[PDB]
Structure formats: C-alpha cells, structure tokens
Design a binder for this molecule. Structure first.
Ligand code: HEM
Ligand code: HEM
Ligand code: HEM
Ligand code: HEM
Lengths: 145, 140, 145, 140
C-alpha cells in the first residue's frame, strides 16, 4: 500500500543507488551485526572480522543478487508475492531461514540508505522504505504462511 | 558489551555531541511515521513535525540514553526507574523497543558519515538492545 | 496448509473444547503472562491479581467472543483472510494492536489446550494447532501487510 | 524474577521431579514438529520419535535448566559456557529460544494439571525468558 507520495519517495531515491555496492554493504552488515546469519554462508570463506566480511568478494557478489531482487520488488509493488515466489520456496522450504531475518535485512538496508543519503533520507522517505522492506519480507515469507 | 563496543558507542556519543536531543526527537518522528502503531502511546501529544512536545520528549530520551552510556556497566540500576515506568505505568509492548532502537540507529546513520561503520553499527545495536532489555525487565 | 491428518487432529480435539470457558482462560492468561496487553482492556475493571483477572466476568465474556472467531477460522481453514477481514480492520486499523500479540495469544491458547487435554495433546496434535493459530494470527494481521 | 516467581518455578520443578529429562526430550520433539526450521540445527540427529539422540539431548537441556533454577540469582554465570556455545559455535538464531521456551511451557502444561495455574505459567514464562536472555547474550 504505497501512496503516490510514498512511491515518489522510493523511486526517486532508488534511481541514485549504486546497485553494485549497496547490496554487499547491507549483506555484510547483516553478517556483522547479526552474526548468527553467518550460519548460512559457510562457503563464503573469511568472515572473521568486519573488514574481512565487508571486503569479501563473495559477500559483495551475493549482495548484488539480493539487491537485484529488491529492485525487482520496487518495480512490482502491487504483486510482491508472485515476484518473490521462487525466492520464498528457496528461503523457506529449502534453506529454512527464519523469516525474522528478512525483517532484519530490510532494516539493515534502511540503515545503509540512511548512511549513504544522510539528510535526504528524511523521516517520510524512511517510512515509505519501511513499507517496501516489510512488503518484501512478508512476500519472501509466504511459504511459511 | 565488549570493551570495543564501549569504545565505539563513546565515539558515536562524542560525535553526536550536543545534537543528541535534536536527534532523539528525529528518531521519535521517524518511529511515529514508520510504525504508526507506536503513536497510540502518545495520544495527548501533537506528533506533527516541529511539535514542541516531540522536541521535549526527544531530549528526555537522549538524556536517558546518555545516562545509560555513562553508567554502561550498571545499566540495570541506572535505568531502573525508567524500566518501572515503561512496564508498569505505560505498558509499552516489548516489540516497540525494537522499533525505537531501529529509528535511533537510522538517525545516527543519517548524521554520522564517518562514524557509522559496520563495527560501530554493531556496537550501537548491542547497546540499544541492552538498554531495551533493561527497559522490558519489569513486567509483572 | 493442513494435511488431512492435521485437520483430523484439530477438529477431533476441538469438538471436546468447552467454548464457554477456554477463551476466557486464554484471554485471562494473556493478560496475566503478558501484562502490557492490559493496556487494551482498561474498561474491564479489576485486573489487579491473577485471580481477579481469571474471575473477572468481562474477561470471560470477551474471551468467549475471541474463541468464537477461532472456531470460525477452524471451519474455514482455506479462507482465513476473508474470515478475519473485519477483525483485521478492527485490530490493526482501529485498535493498533501490535500483531506480535496475535502470535502470543495463539500460543497461550495452545498452552490452555495442553493443560486441559494433557497427554491427548500430543506433539503432532500441537503441531497441527500451531499451523492453525499461526494462520489465524497472519489473517488478523492482514491490514498491516 | 520475583520471590513469588522463584517459589512458583520451584513448585513446578519439584512436581516434575525425575521426569525432567523425559519432558525435555518431549519439548524438543514438540519443537521439531511444530517449528520445522529448528531441525536444521540438528542435521546429524535422527529426530524420529523414540530417537536415543533426542532422549539424550533432552536430558542435557533439562539439566541445564535445573542448574539455572538452582542458581537463579546468578544465571549469567551459571549459563555462561552454554551461552558461548549457542551463540559462537551453534549460531542459534535468537527467535529459536522463544520457540523452545514455548514448547517447554506446553510440555509442562501437558504434565502439570494442578500446578500450571495462570500465576505459575507467568512465572515459568519469565524464568524461560530469563534463561533465553542469557543464552542470547554472547553474539559478537
Ligand atoms: C529478506 C530479503 C532477501 C532477499 C531479497 C534475498 C534474495 C536472494 C537471492 C536473489 C538469492 C540468489 C538466488 C539464486 O542464485 O537464484 C539468494 C540466495 C540465498 N539467500 Fe537470500 N535473500 C534475502 C534474505 C536472506 C537472509 C536473511 C538469509 C540468511 C540469513 C539468506 C540466505 C541465502 C542463501 C544461503 C542463499 C544461497 C542459496 C543457494 O545458492 O543455494 N537470504 N537470496
Ligand atoms: C531507547 C528506549 C527508550 C528510552 C531511553 C525512553 C526514555 C524515556 C524517558 C526518559 C521518559 C520520560 C520519563 C518521565 O520524564 O518520567 C519516557 C517516557 C515515555 N516513553 Fe519512553 N523510552 C524508550 C522507549 C519507549 C518506547 C518504545 C515507547 C513506546 C512506543 C515509549 C513510550 C513512552 C511514553 C508514552 C512516555 C511518557 C510520555 C509523556 O506522557 O510525556 N518509550 N521514555
Ligand atoms: C489473535 C487472536 C484474536 C482474535 C481472534 C480476536 C477476536 C476478537 C473479537 C471476535 C472481537 C469482538 C469484536 C466485536 O465485538 O465485534 C475482539 C475485540 C477486541 N479485541 Fe481481539 N482478538 C484477538 C487478539 C487480540 C489481542 C492480542 C488484543 C490486545 C492485546 C485484542 C484486543 C481487542 C479489543 C480491545 C477488543 C474490543 C474492541 C471494541 O469493542 O471496541 N484482541 N477481538
Ligand atoms: C531453554 C534453552 C536451551 C537450553 C537450556 C539448551 C541447552 C543445551 C545444552 C545443555 C547443550 C549441550 C551442550 C554440550 O553438552 O556442550 C545444548 C546443545 C545444543 N543446543 Fe541447546 N539449549 C537451549 C536452546 C536451544 C535452541 C533454541 C537451539 C536451536 C533451535 C539449540 C540447539 C542446540 C544444538 C544444535 C546443540 C548441540 C547438539 C549436539 O550436537 O549434540 N539449543 N543445548
């Protein structure tokens, strides 16, 4: 349920996002801030320090994929469920990630946007992004519902 | 909180400096707009932008957080009266501390270019989670 | 998504439930165990002690309504969303109850069923009831989604 | 935990008596069936009904909970090694302690007709929440 002003807030900011970087930043911070999530990324090699996490090329590459799916949801705000269906099967039925972590990654992304855009990330812009990341998290959790 | 976490929270505190009360009010506004269920705890407030009441309340919240950081190894004692208030009188749902804490982190991110590194983000998250643990320790 | 065996577990137990009592028991225990929920029930009068809560006639009466809605969901397991639509508007848009409390009340109901049925409330029967109360909680939270 | 809470948890502990390890295994089985995401922490277990491994593990869990109740005013110290294990080695998601705690309460409800009163339910919930708080205090 985004209003047109909420939609404007979201798309005008997203146009400015570096899509090669921001997803790795959010995934890396998830792994640093919520370290239990490292359980799913054993194959990624050195996660021993925050610098090792943030500089790990597999974290950056994987985060690029993660952000690509966010971008696909931003383009389909009225059908997030179909947009996220195969990813919901993957994360829920195959990986068994607790869906609370979908909420945490969304909020980490919000922090990354706040850090990159500073004052431009106003309280109304944040509110619109909170609706988007909650909608993406609920769509990704559909197979638990 | 580890020694490094205390170091990092202190770095952030010192950079925020005398803006803390303004940033507290901004974090409250972020919470009310992003999580409108939290508004019902403030029915007698005007929560509009520029509200003197939100400005005043954000200074109170900031002062409590600075008290907690100044007494970081004794936070249960430092925050005891506020823990009583939030659980017994205000009946704040524990979920809501996660919402305010997120909004406090976003506010810091929006004002701390250099300092909001991944490590300092983690340290601030742990500090706010520890404050929240004390403030939800008194339901009865 | 209940299987037929899950459906059998649920309906065979529910047939035995005292619908005049169990909802008041679950609502009373919610108010005792998660006392912040008393915030929504100021008009109910004496909630000062667990005996006062459990013996309060308004708690019993209100719990009877709450259980009536659970019973309606058990009869419509493939359309919980429409079943709970007006209650979702009420709880989300008018009352602003955090939907975590829908999960807590569901789990309290599970504890009440375990206490009343004892060994008959087997681990598989509990699992089936957990799917039902999660589905009811997600349906009631639809207006937040 | 209030004095009454300590009293109530002790009532429950004493009634459960020497069944505690059996009830721990039942609570684990309840969790695996009700919350299948928790199973992935036990890939090398056979989680089928009657599994010797679940029986053995439930005795360990029960022994840890009894240690925590026996040292209820010093639980951070009593559970320190287990807090390290669950966060650092096992990477247990904090959500999962809420799931096991609920299953432990349901198990007690299913075996404690007289004792699982509303007040004792509240006391056991607070005790398990306090144990969970310690067991999630060491992520780093
Ligand atoms: C909530 C927002 C999330 C989005 C949008 C997202 C998106 C993605 C995408 C696009 C894929 C690549 C799938 C493929 O290669 O086709 C991926 C894979 C994966 N995701 Fe996520 N994800 C989210 C959250 C998480 C979280 C919170 C976790 C764990 C903590 C996780 C762990 C995994 C894993 C382990 C893989 C690899 C799967 C494999 O290759 O076998 N995801 N995710
Ligand atoms: C970082 C967490 C928090 C801190 C440090 C904090 C701090 C404070 C402080 C210092 C007071 C003023 C106490 C009076 O001066 O005795 C207060 C009052 C209050 N707080 Fe919090 N609080 C926190 C989280 C919350 C949350 C999450 C809510 C609800 C969503 C909330 C709701 C209230 C309310 C409604 C008041 C009373 C306001 C008044 O009527 O003027 N607080 N809080
Ligand atoms: C999750 C399962 C729940 C169900 C099925 C449920 C069901 C109901 C029903 C059937 C009604 C009566 C509505 C009418 O009279 O038409 C009611 C009203 C209400 N419910 Fe719930 N409820 C749930 C959870 C909760 C919780 C967790 C809270 C608060 C903690 C809450 C607080 C209220 C209130 C305050 C009313 C009164 C509304 C009014 O009369 O103005 N409900 N609920
Ligand atoms: C009431 C909370 C809990 C208690 C008291 C507890 C206690 C224990 C104990 C005593 C051990 C054995 C330690 C070894 O003997 O060093 C253990 C191991 C473990 N626990 Fe927990 N635990 C708790 C919650 C959880 C949760 C929520 C999970 C996951 C859903 C979990 C997963 C594990 C695993 C996978 C092991 C290692 C098992 C083995 O490989 O044999 N624990 N726990």
């Amino acid at each position: 349920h985004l209003t047109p002003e909420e939609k404007s807030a979201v798309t005008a900011l997203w146009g400015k996002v570096n899509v090669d970087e921001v997803g790795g930043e959010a995934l890396g911070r998830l792994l640093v801030v919520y370290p239990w999530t490292q359980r799913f990324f054993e194959s990624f090699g050195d996660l021993s320090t925050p610098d090792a996490v943030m500089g790990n090329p597999k974290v950056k590459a994987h985060g690029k994929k993660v952000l690509g799916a966010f971008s696909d949801g931003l383009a389909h705000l009225d059908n997030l469920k179909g947009t996220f269906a195969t990813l919901s099967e993957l994360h829920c039925d195959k990986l068994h990630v607790d869906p609370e972590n979908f909420r945490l990654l969304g909020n980490v992304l919000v922090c990354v946007l706040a850090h990159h855009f500073g004052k431009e990330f106003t309280p109304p812009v944040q509110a619109a992004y909170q609706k988007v990341v909650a909608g993406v998290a609920n769509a990704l959790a559909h197979k638990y519902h | 909180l580890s020694p490094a976490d205390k170091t990092n929270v202190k770095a952030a505190w010192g950079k925020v400096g005398a803006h803390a009360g303004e940033y507290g009010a901004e974090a409250l506004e972020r919470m009310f707009l992003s999580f409108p269920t939290t508004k019902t705890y403030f029915p007698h407030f005007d929560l509009s932008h520029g509200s003197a009441q939100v400005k005043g309340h954000g200074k109170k919240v900031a002062d409590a957080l600075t008290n907690a950081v100044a007494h970081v190894d004794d936070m249960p004692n430092a925050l005891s009266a506020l823990s009583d208030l939030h659980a017994h009188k205000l009946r704040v749902d524990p979920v809501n501390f996660k919402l305010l804490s997120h909004c406090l982190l976003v506010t810091l991110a929006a004002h701390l270019p250099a300092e909001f590194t991944p490590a300092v983000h983690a340290s601030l998250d742990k500090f706010l989670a520890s404050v929240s643990t004390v403030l939800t320790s008194k339901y009865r």
